[PDB]
Design a protein around this motif. Structure first.
Motif, PDB file in Angstrom:
ATOM      1  N   UNK B  22       0.692  -1.284  -0.020  1.00 22.57           N
ATOM      2  CA  UNK B  22      -0.213   0.317  -0.099  1.00 22.57           C
ATOM      3  C   UNK B  22       1.192   1.297  -0.126  1.00 22.57           C
ATOM      4  N   UNK B  23       2.312   1.316   0.875  1.00 20.19           N
ATOM      5  CA  UNK B  23       2.059   2.276   0.934  1.00 20.19           C
ATOM      6  C   UNK B  23       3.213   2.623  -0.753  1.00 20.19           C
ATOM      7  N   UNK B  24       3.465   1.135  -1.143  1.00 18.41           N
ATOM      8  CA  UNK B  24       4.565   1.176  -2.307  1.00 18.41           C
ATOM      9  C   UNK B  24       3.276   2.099  -3.055  1.00 18.41           C
ATOM     10  N   UNK B  32       2.050  11.502  -0.608  1.00 20.76           N
ATOM     11  CA  UNK B  32       3.306  10.847   1.126  1.00 20.76           C
ATOM     12  C   UNK B  32       2.099  11.760   2.536  1.00 20.76           C
ATOM     13  N   UNK B  33       1.267  10.331   2.924  1.00 20.01           N
ATOM     14  CA  UNK B  33       1.174  10.791   4.257  1.00 20.01           C
ATOM     15  C   UNK B  33       0.868   9.978   4.918  1.00 20.01           C
ATOM     16  N   UNK B  34       1.734   8.354   4.489  1.00 17.02           N
ATOM     17  CA  UNK B  34       2.032   7.951   5.645  1.00 17.02           C
ATOM     18  C   UNK B  34       2.893   7.433   6.963  1.00 17.02           C
ATOM     19  N   UNK B  35       3.587   8.866   6.150  1.00 15.06           N
ATOM     20  CA  UNK B  35       5.342   9.881   6.985  1.00 15.06           C
ATOM     21  C   UNK B  35       4.626  10.213   8.117  1.00 15.06           C
TER      22      UNK B  35
ATOM     23  N   UNK D 200      -1.291   1.771   9.776  1.00 18.21           N
ATOM     24  CA  UNK D 200      -2.174   1.501   9.423  1.00 18.21           C
ATOM     25  C   UNK D 200      -2.901   2.603   9.666  1.00 18.21           C
ATOM     26  N   UNK D 201      -2.964   3.640  10.990  1.00 16.26           N
ATOM     27  CA  UNK D 201      -4.297   4.647  10.678  1.00 16.26           C
ATOM     28  C   UNK D 201      -4.332   5.437   9.661  1.00 16.26           C
ATOM     29  N   UNK D 202      -3.390   6.265   8.920  1.00 14.34           N
ATOM     30  CA  UNK D 202      -3.156   6.777   8.431  1.00 14.34           C
ATOM     31  C   UNK D 202      -4.363   6.350   7.043  1.00 14.34           C
ATOM     32  N   UNK D 203      -4.974   5.553   7.306  1.00 17.69           N
ATOM     33  CA  UNK D 203      -5.838   5.105   6.226  1.00 17.69           C
ATOM     34  C   UNK D 203      -7.569   5.620   7.091  1.00 17.69           C
ATOM     35  N   UNK D 204      -7.257   5.585   8.000  1.00 19.66           N
ATOM     36  CA  UNK D 204      -9.415   5.863   8.658  1.00 19.66           C
ATOM     37  C   UNK D 204      -8.351   7.712   8.493  1.00 19.66           C
TER      38      UNK D 204
ATOM     39  N   UNK E 216       5.917  23.625  19.224  1.00 21.09           N
ATOM     40  CA  UNK E 216       6.662  22.638  18.923  1.00 21.09           C
ATOM     41  C   UNK E 216       5.861  21.760  18.651  1.00 21.09           C
ATOM     42  N   UNK E 217       5.064  21.327  20.179  1.00 18.74           N
ATOM     43  CA  UNK E 217       3.604  20.542  19.602  1.00 18.74           C
ATOM     44  C   UNK E 217       2.928  21.019  18.461  1.00 18.74           C
ATOM     45  N   UNK E 218       2.508  23.082  18.233  1.00 15.38           N
ATOM     46  CA  UNK E 218       1.891  22.891  17.397  1.00 15.38           C
ATOM     47  C   UNK E 218       2.209  22.989  15.915  1.00 15.38           C
ATOM     48  N   UNK E 219       3.678  22.601  15.149  1.00 16.27           N
ATOM     49  CA  UNK E 219       3.997  22.498  14.106  1.00 16.27           C
ATOM     50  C   UNK E 219       2.893  21.949  13.148  1.00 16.27           C
ATOM     51  N   UNK E 220       2.154  22.231  11.851  1.00 17.18           N
ATOM     52  CA  UNK E 220       1.861  21.301  11.199  1.00 17.18           C
ATOM     53  C   UNK E 220       2.904  20.430  10.183  1.00 17.18           C
ATOM     54  N   UNK E 221       2.179  19.140   9.424  1.00 15.41           N
ATOM     55  CA  UNK E 221       2.526  18.124   9.666  1.00 15.41           C
ATOM     56  C   UNK E 221       3.551  18.780   8.258  1.00 15.41           C
TER      57      UNK E 221
END
Ligand SMILES: CCCCC/C=C/C/C=C/C/C=C/C/C=C/CCCC(=O)O[C@H](COC(=O)CCCCCCCCCCCCCCCCC)COP(=O)(O)O[C@H]1[C@H](O)[C@H](O)[C@@H](O)[C@H](O)[C@H]1O
Ligand SMILES: CCCCCC(=O)OC[C@H](COP(=O)(O)OC[C@H](N)C(=O)O)OC(=O)CCCCC
Ligand SMILES: [Zn+2]
Lengths: 30, 233, 244, 214, 268
Positions: B22-24, B32-35, D200-204, E216-221
């Protein structure tokens, strides 16, 4: 959400696919 | 069983292979949201066949960490930050009791220094804050002090109040209806009738407040905050 | 003094080519049989002095240097006895020494992540990383020439070649230098399994390429004696191809 | 007095990301070795370093924003522990808390700017102050609180509210501390295999995002 | 273009195959593992009908649960794992304070003794590393011991340091300048001037310490990706190659901690 939009990484992916196909054909044809 | 463990390990292998695929695929599409660094915590951690059992009406805090095969009765509360943990042996929690904030129940996770004793929690048992009940059997209708440090081999029989900050030592028996506090724990006095009545009402009041929390705890997650955190600059 | 990857490239890549060059020169340009004498005494001196000097070193790179000198003497044993078996033993020894040197320098580079300097820093390594400890012990034994490993076969066939030409003194000096050589190798072993120092040095984990190369070389060293035919046949063909 | 509070419209409620267990402070990224079991509830901030074979259980809030935090090989910090370090110590030694090999610290251990030597099992509700030196091969009974600057002699187990000598130790009792450390290590190794990398939480999250807007 | 669309399609096929394979693997396990959910925890939430009055200048840890009617002053911060379980009476927290890690502050249900007063917290006061507060009425300029269990009725005044691990009993008031400690009240020593200055310095220093945790804890992805890339890129330096190229690699401004949290000031 329909196109990768990264025209540089796409070439790498297609090159890797070509490499895998060529390796398989090398194993079978030879 | 060993046969179950092999299936469980093969399940690990297949599950991680699926997630890698799935990641691939996701990464190959250009996203890239799995990161993400999502807190990968579960309130019902399980190992092998030691899955926890929680009654339908029991209240478990989102920050509560129930690990192992803890049995939880009806109407008993599992409050914030408690670290209910039974791995080497079971943890028994009755109905209507209240494991308060910042508590934890041990089962003496190790193997040395003798066998491991399961923890029994009775009905309408008031557990104080910062409780570290360590492989001790406690039945219904008793009170535990604020910050007590009970060790293993401790049997506290009925109506046996424990003073706050007590250090009840190993293989110590607390007789019925009396307080036991100090460092080490020493007999203070006898429990009166009004304190017994207070014990009786406290469990009911805390349980009622627990379902009061639980009714609004399963609400929808306020999607406006989720939309706000996405557009953070 | 030289950087660790440089020393890794040295003593393997240069020595192989220079030894092939010396083979080409020796076989053709030498017919007076006067290079037997110059190789004889120098190889004996290399054996003796490497064995007697590597035991007194406390660092790691110096120990590998003197082990390389000793193995150079062991390989040079093959020049003195000029026969097909002598050249075969020489080439087999070069091959085995190259593999063992690659493995040993992979070990050294692995612990270079935390700047290993002496031999005492790798104390109680069987606790922090037991499997790397086992790999290093196996490689050290292969250097020593213990039978159930590669490296014993090379020394064996070198001794066979030495005895084939009647250089009975070469066999005796080889045996005695091997006896002393194994001693400080086992001394390296004791400080890395048995005695535990008060202070422990922690090594961060390795990367995949070094680990894969190390695993391949370790399985080659242990299981070489099970199926050594291809190397022997390659070496016999190579020795005869100098003429036909 | 002021008695003035200003509510903010950008206040964060229900952080969907959870907690972000690893909290770096600039260069001070918490390094953790592989084969070190750290529970998700653990909050790692500052320059805390966890070595291999170690284990940290849920509820621990290890932060090294003042001085670095060191956990030795095969050393476990139990659940709900709180550790810290100070800029300076009353003893004059560097004020950094370091836990050497084979040390069991026990639940509700209030470590701060201490110095723990190998084989120094620590009981529950331990309230170690700054500058304390628990010398090698010592036992600290549950509830022990030692004052700053006090040291525990080797081979002596202490208990009670203050730092109080209780009794001596024998070789058989002393040798069981590494066995306890390796047993906790084995349990942490069993627990480590429960969750794989890259949850796999990113799927949710992606499904929730797809359910409203994009 | 067409190649991008084809690659998106094959990526979708691979993703679907991976999801199916993951589902099959989870099925093979016997459903003995509890799958992970996103987040049931709220950093601060209303209890019955009232939300907490948190100031804009407050650092609240996402792990911390400041529930119910709790009022927080300016500059004061709540650390990780701290529970402000205020559900029956208000928890007035002063300005510039800090309820530290794993700490609990709870209010009795208005009738623990009959005349219960709400848990009031002074300003410029520190609690300290998982102390227990139940009905306390701490005032300004005080220190609470690590893991202390200040119970109901305890009225600790200004300059009223409590020794760590203390168990101050019901309705106990400590005069200013005392160091009462131990399992009982059990007066130990008097608060000296230097110790008062140390308490004040700690209270002032943690105020500027909380700002980096807040930022730091409030940083966006998206900011976190850049932060991790920069941190990995500048982990180690090389004067040789950088000088040879004629360039100097300076740390990025995002990777500079403020000087007030340094061990005493090392701008260089
Ligand atoms: C019941 C189940 C039965 C069984 C079902 C069978 C399913 C068949 C599945 C086959 C999966 C093939 C796996 C082969 C895997 C190869 C390795 C993956 C390579 C890969 O990183 O991806 C691309 C790169 O691209 C290629 O570099 C070179 C591209 C190599 C990979 C291209 C492979 C595409 C083949 C498409 C075949 C379609 C097959 C359709 C299957 C679905 C049919 C329904 C993405 O790079 P990137 O820059 O975004 O990121 C990479 C990546 O993160 C890491 O390598 C590094 O950490 C990072 O530095 C960076 O390098
Ligand atoms: C069939 C499954 C293919 C899965 C392909 C795949 O996952 O590539 C990543 C892996 C590990 O590389 P990363 O550290 O970048 O993983 C990055 C991060 N953990 C991630 O998951 O993306 O590559 C290999 O070793 C495999 C080499 C042999 C490949 C055949
Ligand atoms: Zn309460």
């Amino acid at each position: 959400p329909k196109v990768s939009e990264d025209k540089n990484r796409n070439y790498a992916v297609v090159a890797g696919v070509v490499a895998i196909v060529g390796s398989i054909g090398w194993y079978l044809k030879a | 069983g060993t046969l179950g463990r092999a299936f469980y390990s093969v399940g690990f292998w297949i599950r991680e292979t699926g997630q890698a695929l799935d990641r691939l695929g996701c990464r190959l599409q250009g996203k890239n949201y799995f990161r993400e660094q999502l807190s990968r915590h579960r309130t019902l951690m399980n190992v092998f066949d030691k899955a926890p059992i929680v009654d339908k009406e029991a209240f478990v805090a989102p920050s509560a960490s129930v690990i192992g095969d803890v049995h939880i009765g009806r109407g008993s509360s599992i409050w914030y930050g408690c670290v209910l943990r039974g791995d080497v042996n079971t943890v028994s929690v009755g109905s209507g009791t209240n494991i308060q904030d910042n508590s934890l129940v041990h089962v003496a996770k190790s193997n040395l220094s003798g066998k491991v004793h399961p923890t029994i929690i009775g009905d309408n048992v008031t557990i104080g804050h910062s409780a570290v009940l360590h492989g001790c059997t406690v039945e219904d209708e008793t009170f535990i002090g604020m910050g007590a440090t009970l060790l293993d081999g401790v049997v506290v029989e009925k109506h046996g109040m424990v003073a706050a900050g007590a250090l009840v030592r190993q293989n110590t028996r607390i007789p019925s209806g009396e307080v036991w506090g100090g460092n080490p724990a020493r007999f203070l006095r006898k429990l009166t009738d009004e304190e017994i009545a207070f014990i009786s009402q406290s469990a009911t009041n805390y349980s009622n407040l627990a379902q009061a929390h639980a009714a609004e705890n399963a609400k929808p997650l306020n999607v406006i905050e989720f939309e706000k955190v996405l557009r953070k600059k | 003094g030289s950087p660790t990857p440089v020393t890794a490239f040295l003593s393997i890549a240069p020595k192989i080519s220079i030894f092939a060059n010396i083979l080409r020169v020796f076989i053709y340009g030498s017919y007076g049989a006067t290079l037997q004498q110059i190789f004889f005494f120098c190889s004996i001196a290399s054996m003796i002095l490497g064995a007697l000097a590597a035991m007194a070193q406390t660092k790691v790179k110096r120990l590998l240097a003197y082990s390389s000198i000793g193995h150079v003497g062991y390989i040079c044993i093959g020049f003195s006895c000029g026969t097909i078996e002598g050249i075969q033993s020489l080439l087999i020894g070069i091959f085995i020494y190259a593999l063992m040197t690659m493995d040993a320098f992979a070990i050294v580079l692995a612990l270079r992540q935390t700047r290993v300097k002496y031999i005492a820093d790798l104390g109680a390594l069987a606790k922090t990383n037991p499997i790397l400890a086992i790999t290093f012990s196996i490689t050290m034994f292969s250097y020593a020439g213990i039978p159930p490993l590669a490296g014993f076969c090379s020394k064996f066939y070198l001794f066979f070649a030495a005895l084939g030409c009647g250089a009975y003194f070469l066999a005796l000096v080889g045996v005695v230098t091997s006896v002393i050589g194994c001693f400080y190798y086992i001394r390296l072993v004791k400080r890395m399994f048995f005695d535990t120092p008060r202070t422990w040095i922690l090594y961060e984990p390795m990367d995949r390429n070094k680990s894969l190369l190390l695993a391949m070389t370790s399985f080659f060293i242990t299981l070489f004696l099970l199926y050594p035919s291809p190397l022997f046949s390659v070496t016999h063909q190579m020795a005869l191809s100098l003429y036909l | 007095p002021k008695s003035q509070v200003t509510p903010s419209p950008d206040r964060v409620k229900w952080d969907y990301r959870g907690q972000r267990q690893i909290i770096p402070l600039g260069q001070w990224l918490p390094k953790v070795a592989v084969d070190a079991y750290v529970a998700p509830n653990v909050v790692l901030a500052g320059q805390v370093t966890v070595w291999d074979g170690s284990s940290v259980w849920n509820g621990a809030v290890l932060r090294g924003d003042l001085n670095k935090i060191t956990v030795g090989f095969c050393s476990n910090v139990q659940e709900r522990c709180v550790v810290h370090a100070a800029w300076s110590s009353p003893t004059g030694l560097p004020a950094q808390t370091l836990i050497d090999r084979y040390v069991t610290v026990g639940a509700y251990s209030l470590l701060r700017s201490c110095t723990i030597e190998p084989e120094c099992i620590i009981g529950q509700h331990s309230i170690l102050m700054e500058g304390s030196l628990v010398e090698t091969r010592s036992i600290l009974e549950a509830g022990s609180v030692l004052p700053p600057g006090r040291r525990i002699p080797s081979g002596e187990l202490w208990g009670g509210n203050p730092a109080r000598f209780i009794r001596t130790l024998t070789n058989e009792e002393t040798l069981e501390i590494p066995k306890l450390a390796v047993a906790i290590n084995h349990l942490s190794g069993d627990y480590f295999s429960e969750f794989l990398p890259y949850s796999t939480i990113y799927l949710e999250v992606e499904k929730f995002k797809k359910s409203l807007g994009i | 273009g067409t190649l991008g669309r084809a690659i998106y399609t094959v990526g979708n096929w691979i993703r679907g195959t991976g999801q199916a394979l993951d589902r099959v693997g989870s099925l093979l396990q016997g459903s003995h593992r509890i799958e992970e959910h996103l987040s049931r925890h709220r950093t601060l939430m209303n209890v019955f009908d009232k939300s907490p009055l948190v100031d804009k200048d407050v650092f609240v840890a996402p792990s911390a649960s400041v529930i119910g009617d709790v009022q927080i002053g300016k500059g004061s911060s709540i650390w990780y794992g701290c529970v402000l379980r205020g559900d029956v009476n208000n928890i007035s927290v002063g300005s510039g304070t800090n309820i530290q890690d794993n700490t609990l502050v709870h209010v009795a249900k208005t009738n623990i003794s009959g005349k219960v007063l709400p848990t009031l917290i002074g300003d410029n006061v520190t609690v300290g590393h998982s102390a227990v507060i139940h009905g306390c009425t701490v005032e300004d300029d005080a220190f609470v011991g690590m893991g202390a269990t200040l119970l109901d009725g305890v009225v600790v005044e200004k300059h009223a340091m409590v020794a760590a691990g203390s168990l101050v009993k019901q309705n106990t008031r400590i005069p200013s300048g005392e160091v009462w400690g131990g399992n009982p009240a059990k007066f130990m020593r008097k608060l000296t001037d230097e110790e008062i200055v140390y308490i004040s310095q700690s209270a002032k220093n943690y105020i500027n310490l909380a700002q980096i945790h807040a930022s730091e804890n409030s940083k966006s992805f998206e900011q976190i990706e850049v932060e991790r890339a920069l941190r990995k890129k500048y982990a180690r330096k090389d004067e040789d190659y950088d000088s040879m190229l004629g360039i100097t690699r300076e740390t990025p401004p995002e990777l500079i901690l403020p000087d007030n949290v340094l061990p005493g000031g090392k701008p260089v």
